[PDB]
Scaffold this active site. Structure first.
Site, PDB file in Angstrom:
ATOM      1  N   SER A  67      59.984  34.679  50.410  1.00 22.59           N
ATOM      2  CA  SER A  67      60.205  33.786  51.725  1.00 22.59           C
ATOM      3  C   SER A  67      58.839  33.287  52.011  1.00 22.59           C
ATOM      4  O   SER A  67      58.258  32.409  51.212  1.00 22.59           O
ATOM      5  CB  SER A  67      60.914  34.391  52.932  1.00 22.59           C
ATOM      6  OG  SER A  67      60.955  33.497  53.979  1.00 22.59           O
ATOM      7  N   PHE A 118      73.871  29.730  56.531  1.00 20.87           N
ATOM      8  CA  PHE A 118      73.040  30.649  57.648  1.00 20.87           C
ATOM      9  C   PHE A 118      71.694  30.054  57.482  1.00 20.87           C
ATOM     10  O   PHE A 118      70.619  30.728  57.570  1.00 20.87           O
ATOM     11  CB  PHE A 118      73.080  31.968  57.383  1.00 20.87           C
ATOM     12  CG  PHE A 118      74.326  32.567  57.141  1.00 20.87           C
ATOM     13  CD1 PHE A 118      75.439  32.643  57.973  1.00 20.87           C
ATOM     14  CD2 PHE A 118      74.678  33.383  55.740  1.00 20.87           C
ATOM     15  CE1 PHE A 118      76.816  33.189  57.497  1.00 20.87           C
ATOM     16  CE2 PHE A 118      75.625  33.932  55.511  1.00 20.87           C
ATOM     17  CZ  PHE A 118      76.663  33.723  56.222  1.00 20.87           C
ATOM     18  N   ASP A 166      70.850  28.233  48.523  1.00 23.40           N
ATOM     19  CA  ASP A 166      70.043  28.083  49.763  1.00 23.40           C
ATOM     20  C   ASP A 166      69.810  26.681  49.875  1.00 23.40           C
ATOM     21  O   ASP A 166      69.963  25.868  49.227  1.00 23.40           O
ATOM     22  CB  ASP A 166      68.697  28.892  49.757  1.00 23.40           C
ATOM     23  CG  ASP A 166      67.699  28.208  48.515  1.00 23.40           C
ATOM     24  OD1 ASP A 166      68.166  27.368  47.897  1.00 23.40           O
ATOM     25  OD2 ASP A 166      66.724  28.700  48.530  1.00 23.40           O
ATOM     26  N   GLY A 219      68.690  36.204  51.257  1.00 27.19           N
ATOM     27  CA  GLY A 219      68.694  37.495  51.593  1.00 27.19           C
ATOM     28  C   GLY A 219      69.779  38.346  50.356  1.00 27.19           C
ATOM     29  O   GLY A 219      70.293  39.178  50.708  1.00 27.19           O
TER      30      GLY A 219
HETATM   31  C1  LIG Z   1      66.185  31.775  60.680  1.00 24.95           C
HETATM   32  C2  LIG Z   1      66.101  32.066  59.545  1.00 24.95           C
HETATM   33  C3  LIG Z   1      65.057  32.794  58.537  1.00 24.95           C
HETATM   34  C4  LIG Z   1      65.788  33.621  57.678  1.00 24.95           C
HETATM   35  C5  LIG Z   1      66.961  32.637  57.431  1.00 24.95           C
HETATM   36  C6  LIG Z   1      67.529  32.310  58.797  1.00 24.95           C
HETATM   37  O1  LIG Z   1      68.323  31.238  58.917  1.00 24.95           O
HETATM   38  C7  LIG Z   1      68.396  33.511  59.174  1.00 24.95           C
HETATM   39  C8  LIG Z   1      67.407  34.663  59.454  1.00 24.95           C
HETATM   40  C9  LIG Z   1      66.147  34.836  58.426  1.00 24.95           C
HETATM   41  C10 LIG Z   1      66.051  36.128  57.572  1.00 24.95           C
HETATM   42  C11 LIG Z   1      66.244  37.685  57.766  1.00 24.95           C
HETATM   43  C12 LIG Z   1      65.647  38.315  57.013  1.00 24.95           C
HETATM   44  C13 LIG Z   1      65.216  38.048  55.507  1.00 24.95           C
HETATM   45  O2  LIG Z   1      63.644  37.892  55.339  1.00 24.95           O
HETATM   46  C14 LIG Z   1      65.510  36.427  55.351  1.00 24.95           C
HETATM   47  C15 LIG Z   1      65.050  36.025  53.842  1.00 24.95           C
HETATM   48  C16 LIG Z   1      66.849  36.366  55.453  1.00 24.95           C
HETATM   49  O3  LIG Z   1      67.800  36.437  54.550  1.00 24.95           O
HETATM   50  O4  LIG Z   1      67.404  35.853  56.672  1.00 24.95           O
HETATM   51  C17 LIG Z   1      65.067  35.522  56.488  1.00 24.95           C
HETATM   52  C18 LIG Z   1      65.194  34.070  56.461  1.00 24.95           C
HETATM   53  C19 LIG Z   1      63.765  33.400  56.337  1.00 24.95           C
HETATM   54  O5  LIG Z   1      62.845  33.999  56.840  1.00 24.95           O
HETATM   55  O6  LIG Z   1      63.477  32.380  55.539  1.00 24.95           O
END
Ligand SMILES: C=C1C[C@]23C[C@@]1(O)CC[C@H]2[C@@]12C=C[C@H](O)[C@@](C)(C(=O)O1)[C@H]2[C@@H]3C(=O)O
Lengths: 150, 334, 109, 434
Positions: free
Chosen positions: B182, B229, B280, B311
């Protein structure tokens, strides 16, 4: 209704009754009578009385029209504050002697704004005043406020 | 409803809870609710005792900026008793031992190195790749914006390279691979760029769902907006709270392939592994990043996963997990 | 040649740091600076949805010391990093706890 | 049972309630999208959350409100000849455990010689440890300074007031039983908080128990008089009672003059004093039973997260050594003063007593969260989940000194830990009658 105001010097100003009721002190003396013959002023200069009367006049007029706008008012206030030091001073004393709260707030705000972001060696220069503290008292007050100097 | 058909239930619930939590921690003005975030966050602690072949311990590498690094390595074969404090930093045994320097995700805003979601990932990386792993704890915007993250990465890289107990028999040099996910992908890319013209030689890069962007809305943002999401409102809040006030998304830290960015041709860059999830929201940018490498003259193997989302490397109950792991194991142990 | 009341009227609308700087210019200004009303207004500038009266709290704070020692001991360092931040109920609870503990520390048996 | 994946991830979700949790999340999301920024500000600052690991309960609360072992090691960088010192210390412990005196004596001498050139915290830890082993071989104001130089007691005390206050809202007569009055530097904040409350400042009763005065003076009387005067100066009813006793095993339920539970609420407090009872066979159990008989609404416990009650002496030595070395390392940045020196001396004395006094004399016998919880669960006590408020308070506390760095509060399983980064040091928690 038209009200005659007499300055200390002797200049006479014709005012709108409404405009006069903006001053609660003048309104209070008017309800108590003894003011139909004339309302003299012991300590009030004709020029400062004229400037305050223009301010209340314009304000009252604007208010009435709106009831029947804020940007224009702000512009006018900014344009009416283009004077020097001693005139603002005579105006604050006049505003206090007549009790006109809105003009008092504007004048106090302008003085506050000019003394904004100033230090002990600056305000003194602006007002040419005397520091009368002893070295011990000066260090004590400075130490109490040392947090402000960081 | 569409999200419930492409992922299992547990990944769905995890990502949805994270999305809700970071929804309620956002602020329009630009400030970030740090205390409630740290409360809602789930962290772990280092454990020197072996756990399925993996112990770990914290190293306070830098004290001026509280830069900590969590190190993991395989359990010792020749030691039946648990390793002592003295034995924790004994030199590794083997001709070639890789060292993966890992940067976690969270849009420069969430999680930490001692967070469990990344502790488990680092432990699995150590187990399958069979090598040492150093997790860097860089500083987090918006309290500390650009460029503090790249500096923390560079300092941790210098510390890792400067060690002695982490070396190799054949060349008396350290075999460092940079990895990230990320936002950590962006940090790894920038630190590798800095190392390219500094002396430190880097073996490769492992970018997972990297975070790149620009001003012109690509063609995967409109349709995918609020479907898996991931929304675009957040994609602007996170970039605004990171870059310096009074700057657009064409800055070089946001878009390396910009007119103001330096060309990658003519400079040394290592091999890299770009993992891209098809479902994504940011699918048009990550792929464009790979193409910028491809035309720049550098080696890159693209792994387009047509049915993966964000994720997809947190739980082992899907098929993409095994695949990615196998590719990284074959790319690090090559 | 300013009087006292007008100095208070002018300084009612000045910020904290500027009032602290102005406290060291002259005697009349120094005397006007400790009027607890000015510091009370500067301390209750962002206190939205407190939960008690403004008179009771005033009584307690005056009992414990005042307002000049409550904003220049705990509120200041706590607001040093982020200036533009409204102070909630937690800020009041913490600052008053530290102030009361200090008063106890200075208390004589 | 609990999902394996989620469990190792860091969340407690039953396998039969996954679908329910998902549905709740979907409803919460739609509801949050319907409302504007105000809804989010409301959940940001107004509401509070308890036990986030339980996704079910947490989500339920949110919905209702919106719509009404493990040994941590931290290698420091300041180490150039530290291995020689640690090695020597271990050798001394091994020689002491093998019966050999001459070896130990020589070793101690060598430790001092190699510790005379060491700098930083290693010098102080090694010197105090060497003195402790010398004492071992021979037999074979401090607190105020510490409180003014360390956040440990301040953080413990504030978290305790927050818990009791959150367990006293909507009550009238409040009685407090304290197992460590010390200086009574915690009660001021509690009294003001109970004063500036909604509904009126209720009657406050306090009964403090302390160790026998060693100089035959009167300290509890001074604390009581000071507290009553400040009470009046704050306008709140207040009754004081002081007690003098050696340990905590002699304390009874009748020797406290309690009122009916139906007309009052009792709250018990303890800050680093429970670990002194473990030395007497049956003590801790007796005190737990009497506390149960007291039937209070909250029991606050603050302790040090470390296992030092281990049988083997070598293990104790190692653990204590590393724990105190990291503790001394955490005070090398503050400038030279008097409080720091006093605190260092206090720590040194503590370390010496630990590695020199055995049997019942040894009172510094600590344990971790798991052990303490097992001891509490055998008597009929349930946990009490702290909230975000206490967390925020502690955060601000640490941010007031040294721009909030180094010490970090971490919430885990409904308890708070203040630690040097990722090394838990102080663990505060609350319990109640099951
Ligand atoms: C606001 C956010 C940021 C997410 C996507 C989301 O829409 C939802 C939560 C974050 C997150 C949480 C943990 C992981 O590092 C990540 C890559 C994910 O899958 O989801 C994280 C991901 C990111 O950091 O890009």
């Amino acid at each position: 209704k038209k009200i005659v105001l007499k300055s200390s010097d002797g200049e006479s100003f014709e005012v709108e009754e409404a405009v006069a009721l903006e001053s609660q002190t003048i309104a209070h003396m008017v309800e108590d009578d003894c003011v139909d013959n004339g309302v003299p002023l012991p300590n009030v200069t004709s020029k400062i009385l004229a400037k305050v009367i223009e301010y209340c006049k314009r304000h009252v007029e604007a208010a009435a029209s709106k009831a029947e706008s804020d940007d224009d008012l702000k512009a006018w206030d900014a344009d009416f504050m283009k004077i020097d030091q001693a005139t603002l001073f005579e105006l604050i004393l006049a505003a206090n002697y007549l009790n006109i709260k809105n003009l008092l707030d504007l004048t106090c705000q302008t003085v506050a704004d000019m003394i904004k972001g100033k230090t002990p060696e600056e305000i003194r220069t602006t007002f040419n005043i005397k520091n009368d503290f002893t070295p011990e008292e000066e260090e004590e007050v400075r130490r109490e406020n040392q947090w402000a100097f960081e | 409803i569409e999200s419930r058909t492409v992922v299992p239930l547990n990944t769905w619930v995890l990502i949805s809870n994270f999305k809700v939590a970071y929804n309620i921690l956002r602020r329009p003005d630009g400030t970030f609710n740090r205390h409630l975030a740290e409360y809602l966050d789930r962290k772990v602690t280092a454990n020197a005792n072996p756990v399925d072949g993996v112990f770990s311990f914290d190293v306070l590498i830098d004290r001026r900026i509280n830069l900590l690094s969590r190190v993991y390595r395989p359990a010792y074969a020749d030691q039946e008793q648990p390793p002592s404090i003295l034995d924790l930093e004994k030199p590794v045994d083997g001709d070639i031992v890789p060292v993966i320097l890992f940067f976690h995700g969270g849009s420069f805003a969430h999680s930490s190195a001692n967070s469990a979601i990344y502790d488990t990932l680092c432990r699995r990386l150590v187990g399958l790749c069979k090598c040492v792993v150093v997790s860097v704890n860089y500083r987090r915007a918006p309290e500390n914006p650009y460029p503090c993250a790249y500096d923390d990465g560079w300092i941790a890289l210098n510390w890792v390279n400067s060690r002695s107990w982490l070396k190799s028999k054949k060349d008396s040099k350290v075999h460092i691979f940079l990895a990230g996910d990320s936002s950590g992908g962006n940090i790894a890319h920038n630190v590798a760029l800095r190392a390219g013209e500094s002396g430190i030689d880097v073996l490769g890069n492992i970018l997972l769902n990297p975070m790149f962007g620009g001003n012109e809305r690509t063609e995967s943002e409109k349709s995918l907006d609020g479907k898996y999401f991931v929304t675009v409102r957040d994609r602007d809040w996170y970039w605004k709270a990171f870059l310096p006030e009074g700057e657009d998304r064409e800055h070089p830290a946001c878009n390396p392939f910009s007119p103001r960015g330096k060309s990658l041709e003519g400079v040394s860059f290592p091999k890299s592994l770009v993992v891209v999830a098809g479902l994504d929201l940011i699918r048009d940018w990550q792929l464009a990043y790979a193409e910028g490498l491809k035309k720049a003259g550098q080696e890159v193997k693209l792994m387009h996963l047509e049915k993966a989302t964000v994720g997809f490397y947190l739980l082992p109950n899907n098929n993409h997990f095994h695949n990615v792991m196998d590719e990284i194991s074959a790319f690090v142990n090559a | 040649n300013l009087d006292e009341n007008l100095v208070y009227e002018v300084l009612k609308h000045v910020d904290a740091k500027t009032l602290a700087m102005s406290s060291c210019v002259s005697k009349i200004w120094h005397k006007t600076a400790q009027d607890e009303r000015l510091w009370e207004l500067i301390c209750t500038r962002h206190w939205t949805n407190i939960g008690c009266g403004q008179n009771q709290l005033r009584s307690v704070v005056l009992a414990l010391g005042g307002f000049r020692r409550l904003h220049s001991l705990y509120l200041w360092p706590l607001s040093k990093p982020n200036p533009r931040a409204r102070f909630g109920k937690d800020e009041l609870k913490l600052t008053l706890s530290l102030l009361s503990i200090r008063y106890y520390k200075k208390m004589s048996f | 049972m609990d999902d394996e994946l989620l469990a190792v991830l860091g969340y407690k979700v039953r396998s039969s309630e996954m679908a329910e949790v998902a549905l709740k999340l979907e409803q919460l999301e739609t509801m949050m999208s319907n409302v504007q920024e105000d809804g989010l500000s409301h959940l940001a600052t107004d509401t509070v959350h308890y036990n986030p690991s339980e996704l079910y309960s947490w989500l339920d609360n949110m919905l209702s409100e919106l719509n009404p072992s493990t040994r941590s090691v931290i290698l420091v960088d300041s180490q150039e000849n530290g291995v020689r010192l640690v090695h020597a210390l271990m050798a001394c412990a091994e020689a002491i455990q093998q019966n050999n005196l001459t070896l130990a004596e020589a070793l101690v001498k060598q430790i001092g010689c190699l510790a005379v050139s060491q700098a930083g915290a290693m010098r102080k830890v090694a010197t105090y440890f060497a003195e402790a082993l010398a004492r071992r071989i021979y037999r074979l104001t401090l607190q105020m300074h510490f409180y003014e130089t360390c956040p440990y007691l301040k953080f413990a005390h504030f978290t305790a007031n927050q818990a009791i206050l959150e367990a006293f809202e909507g009550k009238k007569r409040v009685h407090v039983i304290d197992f460590s009055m010390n200086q009574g530097l915690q009660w001021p904040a509690l009294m003001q908080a109970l004063a500036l409350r909604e509904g009126g400042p209720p009657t406050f009763r306090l009964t403090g128990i302390g160790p026998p005065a060693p100089d035959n003076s009167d300290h509890l009387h001074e604390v009581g008089c000071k507290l009553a005067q400040l009470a009046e100066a704050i306008h709140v009813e207040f009754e004081y009672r002081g007690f003098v006793a050696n340990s905590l095993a002699d304390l009874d339920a009748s020797m406290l003059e309690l009122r009916p539970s139906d007309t009052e609420a009792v709250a018990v407090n303890s800050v680093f004093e429970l670990h002194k009872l473990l030395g007497r066979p049956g003590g801790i159990e007796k005190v737990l039973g009497v506390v149960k008989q007291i039937k209070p609404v909250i029991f606050t416990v603050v302790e040090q997260e470390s296992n030092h009650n281990g049988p083997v002496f070598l293990d104790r030595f190692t653990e204590s050594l590393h724990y105190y070395s990291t503790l001394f390392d955490s005070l090398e940045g503050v400038p030279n003063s008097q409080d720091k020196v006093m605190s260092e001396v206090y720590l040194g004395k503590q370390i010496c007593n630990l590695v020199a006094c055995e049997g019942p004399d040894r009172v510094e016998r600590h344990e971790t969260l798991s052990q303490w919880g097992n001891r509490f669960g055998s008597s009929g006590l349930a946990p009490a989940h702290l909230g975000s408020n206490a967390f925020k308070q502690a955060s601000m506390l640490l941010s007031v000194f040294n721009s909030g760095q180094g010490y970090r509060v971490e919430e885990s399983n409904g308890c708070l830990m203040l630690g040097w980064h990722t090394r838990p040091l102080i663990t505060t928690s609350a319990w109640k009658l099951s």
